[PDB]
Amino acid sequence: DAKNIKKGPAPFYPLEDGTAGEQLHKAMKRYALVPGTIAFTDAHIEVNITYAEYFEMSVRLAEAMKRYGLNTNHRIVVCSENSLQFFMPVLGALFIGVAVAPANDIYNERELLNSMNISQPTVVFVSKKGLQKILNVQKKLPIIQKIIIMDSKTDYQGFQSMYTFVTSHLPPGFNEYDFVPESFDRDKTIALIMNSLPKGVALPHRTACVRFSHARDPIFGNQIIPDTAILSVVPFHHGFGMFTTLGYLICGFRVVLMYRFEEELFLRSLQDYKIQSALLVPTLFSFFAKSTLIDKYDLSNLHEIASGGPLSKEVGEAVAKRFHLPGIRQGYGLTETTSAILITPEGDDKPGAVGKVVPFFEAKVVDLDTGKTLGVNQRGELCVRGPMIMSGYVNNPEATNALIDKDGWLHSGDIAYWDEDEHFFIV
């Protein structure tokens, strides 16, 4: 009974052709041609980096990795706290079809080895503070041939930086605006291998392309308006950070980052950078329900606070009230679904609804002992189907088939119901 399968609407704008790297490249080139356009801002050290800087260095890294010898058969790891440099190797790799495996930078050596034993990288990009851990892992995973330091200008402790790596490999006369990203099959070529012992989640380029249609949707994402700024405290190596940020870059927004949470910096940054949209991890919502300092800042530019999910009905309402917002912009997604597949539509927040099925997707709820599909206001297991579902867990077809059934439905593990307006609620 199709009336019991909720479907997203058609996307505001039609899904664009091209790999995720081609689409990012094309949009970034354009912002690059407008001097002063800010891509990232590090709120701790107060430095901005523009789209022209970001674009040029991303293109240079892509060409350098290609000349070094990386192609679609290789993976890289990016292991770092949020920083201005984080997305440089991510973009460079997407531009040439090299899969990117972000490794949690607070994993100790063991969970790190487990993660990198799955992704099997040839090159690892690391911040200065992660170098020791990577060197200790490399002792056990000889596939790691090359370690490149992200947040350094010069070489660092005998390792090249992104800058000196690039200078070692670029041909003479290299032109960043003549460069053309690689073209390849966006269903078969993996863009990201995300962690969730954790497993590795392979996400084809297609899934990011679909995200890029949601991100700029006026209903399911953020409308492209000039001088939009986002404050993001979420980790870039996790799906909430990775896939919002990639979409913010497509949109030309200013991504103000923090790599560690502090109350006064966070609030002062909302005020002073006139943030329109702020992202919080789940336990930062409980924090802000306790906060009283909110009242002392001018937050009149703030339009939304977005959660990654699903929040408790109470904590959600408490936060929305302290920030004088009508509600929280909720998402529900898993690492296995790339990003959010139920999202609060812009304007149309409800109570403790998580939101509505995004474009390209389907969702249903099924009876828990039988697998049968349910009708409205009935509680069952949330299942979703659509082109952001992962290709599978890396080297683990059994965990894959356990999650995703033969008709392509992912079984989320969560209990839900949908209502007469087609809003979903996680219970």
Features:
five-stranded antiparallel β-sheet, alpha/beta, nine-stranded mixed β-sheet, globular, monomer, 427 residues, monooxygenase, oxidoreductase, Rossmann fold
Question: Describe it for me?
Answer:
With 427 residues, the chain is α/β, with parallel strands linked by helices. The protein has a single domain (1-427), classed as Rossmann fold (3-Layer(aba) Sandwich). It has helices spanning 20-32, 51-68, 87-96, 109-119, 131-138, 162-169, 205-215, 239-251, 263-272, 282-290, 313-322, 397-403, and strands at residues 6-7, 38-42, 48-50, 75-79, 99-102, 123-126, 146-149, 190-195, 200-204, 229-232, 254-257, 277-280, 304-307, 329-333, 340-343, 356-357, 362-366, 380-385, 392-393, 410-418, 424-426. Strands 3-2-11-10-12-13-14-15-16 form a nine-stranded mixed sheet, sandwiched between helices. Strands 1-17-18-20-21 form a five-stranded antiparallel sheet, with no helix packed on it. Strands 5-4-6-7 form a four-stranded parallel sheet, with helices on both faces.
Short description:
Keywords: ATP-binding, Luminescence, Magnesium, Metal-binding, Monooxygenase, Nucleotide-binding, Oxidoreductase, Peroxisome, Photoprotein. This protein has one domain: 3-Layer(aba) Sandwich (Rossmann fold). The chain is built from twelve helices and 21 strands.
Helix content: 25-40%
Task: Write the CATH homologous superfamily.
Answer: ANL, N-terminal domain
Strand residue content = 15-25%
CATH fold-level topology = Rossmann fold
Largest sheet: 9 strands, mixed
The radius of gyration computed from the alpha-carbon positions, rounded to a whole number of angstroms, is 21 Å
Widest sheet, order of strands: 3-2-11-10-12-13-14-15-16
DSSP strand tally:
21
- Indicate the CATH architecture: 3-Layer(aba) Sandwich
* SS field, number of helical segments: 12
Q: Per the principal axes of the C-alpha atoms, what is the gross shape?
A: globular
CATH class (first level) name: Alpha Beta
What count of domains describes the coordinates?
1
Structural class: alpha/beta
The N- and C-terminal alpha carbons lie at a distance of 24 Å
Subcellular location: Peroxisome
EC number: 1.13.12.7
Protein name: Luciferin 4-monooxygenase
Cofactor: Mg(2+)
